[PDB]
């Protein structure tokens, strides 16, 4: 049983560390359009202009 | 009677020597066993990796 414990245990320690570079990833992705959106904004003032 | 005696317990003396290197033996594979486990907790966190 415990081997089964720590085979889940440790698999989901790794699984947790890969979800939290994909939390970085996102993150970074986010940062992105953030400022495609302050250009967007910009391109409407522009538009507007 | 005695001889047949004599007969049991010496050569249940050997045969109590030939299980006890058969213990030894069945624990080095225990052993062995053993990584071969800790092997397989890696393969488990390198396939999540």
Known sequence: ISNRL???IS???VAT???NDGISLAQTA???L???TNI???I???ALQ
Chains 1, 2 share one sequence.
């Open 17 to 19: 560390r890969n979800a």
């Open 11 to 13: 698999g989901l320690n």
């Open 44 to 46: 409407r003032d522009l």
């Open 34 to 36: 953030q400022q495609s």
């Open 40 to 42: 967007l904004q910009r």
């Open 30 to 32: 986010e940062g992105a």
């Open 6 to 8: 720590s085979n889940q």
